[PDB]
Specification:
The structure is a homodimer of 403-residue chains.
Chain A: H1 4-14, E1 22-30, E2 33-36, E3 41-44, H2 47-50, H3 59-69, E4 80-81, H4 84-95, E5 99-103, H5 106-123, E6 133-137, H6 146-150, H7 155-158, E7 168-171, H8 176-182, E8 188-193, H9 209-219, E9 223-227, E10 251-254, E11 266-270, H10 272-275, H11 291-306, H12 309-324, E12 332-338, E13 341-346, H13 354-363, E14 366-367, E15 375-378, H14 386-401
Parallel strand pairs in A: 3-14, 6-7, 6-8, 8-9, 9-10
Antiparallel strand pairs in A: 1-2, 2-3, 5-11, 10-11, 12-13, 13-15
Bound molecules: ligand I3B (2 copies).
Enzyme class (chains A, B): transferase
Keywords (chains A, B): Acetylation, Aminotransferase, Disease variant, Mitochondrion, Pyridoxal phosphate, Transferase, Transit peptide
GO biological process, one term (chains A, B): arginine catabolic process to proline via ornithine
């Protein structure tokens, strides 16, 4: 039986070094808990970047996969499968959009959104071909494709990865005057923005920012693209993080928790006047819309609905942030977030940083990832209960004040 | 009980119109057979673009998925999981490369290969930053991302989709002189090519083109990237189509049959000097390398090995091409292919075409899809047997001569 150090050394020898994970080798997961190969038990306070909002191996999602895998898993889109239309009707009625375009990973949904915005910009808005612009916010993250890192302001994402995709403008985040200035270019076809910036360090914009984006985009006839791949599906306390200001984006991107972690499923939602600019043969994906991922996506959505995970994430997130703000200011310098998507800012020194705090948190039974050496994210599964949350808060307080 | 027509209209109402599939609504699949919602039984001669080489719902792959879904499905790569290193050692030793970078979809493996080539071009070869070029062959297909369509010579894939990715040069397929001409530029970092062009219509290059490409790339210090996402994993009669010419590419792209159609799993294989140009935090993906997909990948590869599907694809492919060449020259003008990846060219008129041939093949219990109005692909799962193949050949004969 391989030990933890045996697992690390194997991946180091046979796997690419594109990651430096926290040294812990998990083998089992259920609900909010993870178990390493030595049997130790941990609070999962990362949730695989909100991909297991429903908890690890939720039985209802597991049973949908097990039932469908015996029947049919992949026909490709050259033919019809019987499950896709069921999932399509369900999700478009749920979020109240005309249609959905199914993909697999989150960056594939973002690529589809950029392609929809350009095609709509040329064939509907009438922009001169191949001058269409898409505006992004600084600190944005929507994948690791060449196009995704082309709009990135993070040097680690784009440094050394070749000439970059043109047609992408970058403005500061949480800045309405900068968006107004950017939207003066009549070649702008879309503004793609996260309601909360996850990988940037759980950056929450000021109240009214989302209404301002919706108003500005409407006034200049520009597509409002909301990337809810991380913020959506009850993680911030609502079905969509844009529900906190009640704005209707033109294009909504879903993913991650869309399958509870059991299958790579993403989705792109918009109305007919945007969706139907793409004709047959002009876009798609091999596994996109396969019957297996559709069954787990139907079940993963039903778990969020019938277990009221959005409400639980809302009231539990207020407890988490309030308890975190009691830590001394000379240790944590900021606590922010919405619902169960939160982060703390560490007064980093030369000797003490967020990585060491996470190593000690692991020692005390709580797993979390640092995002920038002074930021630590706390995002547990939404099925957590108040007592389990308070137990984890005890682990956080003890670890933080033990330095 | 939704009927076949009901399934068509439901997807039309709530789903994007990016496809025009053959009108047949499948709900069950096993081995080489597919069943529609009315209970009719079909031969599958597309294999979901070689994604179910092992047949639909192979019990060994299904059992691997059913066993792992209850333990653990997704930790993200911020932590370690016990399954990934097992798959990494298995797939690297199997194909004889140092390391593997796991991704989900085929286009994501292509994007990863491009990022590896560029990072290798700047950090190892010494190209000034963002002058690196990647050469592609006309008629190529490797996904629908912005980067992917930026190298396509098919207008239906790049038309109306905005500014394109710089640094992508295109040369004619099956053209060694054009390749050396393109490689005279020292800023070229890689050449990505399919050993047999699938979506182009099963375009098999001349003998020696592969070892010539291998020789030209090595001479000019250029990375040879072989896209075996469709040609690899026994579909053409070998583990990799390049094995027919003993060619070892610098980077191999695998995908799609890598999971037997049960999960989106793709792989990027290369040695240390190429792979380790990407440092921790510089590339990744949420679902890339999750334990659930690694288990079904190990089982999918094991099925291909211990069932000798490459030898089976080699033998039966010879029979299939032999029988197909017995068709008259005024109806079928060309028959090409390696192993069980084959295609026929239809003497298309205004009267009849390949779509009507595939419609009537569907009527006679065999599913296949045309690729260009005059090309029809015949690619059944590699678990097919000779008598089952000959029954299908009879169906292919009687439909063609029925026009
Ligand atoms: C998901 N990214 C969250 C952090 C994961 C980093 C990593 O690469 O390991 C995310 C995406 C991309 O989704 P995929 O990783 O391609 O499935 C896009 N947009 C948002 C808001 C995300 O959180
Ligand atoms: C897979 N062939 C794509 C099948 C076309 C149907 C569709 O819906 O697009 C393939 C890829 C792309 O892999 P992914 O679709 O991204 O998983 C890349 N390269 C080759 C040679 C393929 O066969």
């Amino acid at each position: 039986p391989p030990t933890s150090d045996d697992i690390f050394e194997r991946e180091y020898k046979y796997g690419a070094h594109n990651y430096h994970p926290l040294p812990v080798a998990l083998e089992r997961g259920k609900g909010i808990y993870l178990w390493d190969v030595e049997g130790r038990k941990y609070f999962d306070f990362l949730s695989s970047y909100s991909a297991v909002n429903q908890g690890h191996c939720h039985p209802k999602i597991v049973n949908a996969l097990k039932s469908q895998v015996d029947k049919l898993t992949l026909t490709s889109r050259a033919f019809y499968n019987n499950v896709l239309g069921e999932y399509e009707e369900y999700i478009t009625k749920l979020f109240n959009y005309h249609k959905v375009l199914p993909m697999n990973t989150g960056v594939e949904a973002g690529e589809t959104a950029c392609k929809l915005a350009r095609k709509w910009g040329y064939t509907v808005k009438g922009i001169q071909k191949y001058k269409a612009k898409i505006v992004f916010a600084a600190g944005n993250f929507w994948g690791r494709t060449l196009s995704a890192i082309s709009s990135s302001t993070d040097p680690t994402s784009y440094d050394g990865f070749g000439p970059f995709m043109p047609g992408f403008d970058i403005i500061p985040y949480n800045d309405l005057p900068a968006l107004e200035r950017a939207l003066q270019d009549p070649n702008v076809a879309a503004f793609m923005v996260e309601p909360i910036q996850g990988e940037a360090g759980v950056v929450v914009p000021d109240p009214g920012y989302l209404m301002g984006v919706r108003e500005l985009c409407t006034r200049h006839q520009v597509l409002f693209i909301a990337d809810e791949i991380q913020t959506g599906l009850a993680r911030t306390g609502r079905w969509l993080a844009v529900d906190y200001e009640n704005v209707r984006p033109d294009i909504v991107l879903l993913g991650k928790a869309l399958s509870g972690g059991l299958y790579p499923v993403s989705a792109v939602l918009c109305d007919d006047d945007i969706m139907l600019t793409i004709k047959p043969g002009e876009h798609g994906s091999t596994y996109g819309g396969n019957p297996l991922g559709c069954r787990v996506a139907i079940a993963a959505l039903e778990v969020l609905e019938e277990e009221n995970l959005a409400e639980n994430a809302d009231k539990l997130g207020i407890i988490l942030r309030n308890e975190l703000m009691k830590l001394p200011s000379d240790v944590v310098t900021a606590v922010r977030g919405k619902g169960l998507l939160n982060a703390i800012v560490i007064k980093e020194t030369k000797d003490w940083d967020a990585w060491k705090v996470c190593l000690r948190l692991r020692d005390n039974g709580l797993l979390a990832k640092p995002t920038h050496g002074d930021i630590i994210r706390f995002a547990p599964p939404l099925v957590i209960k108040e007592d389990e949350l308070r137990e984890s808060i005890e682990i956080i307080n003890k670890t933080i004040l033990s330095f």
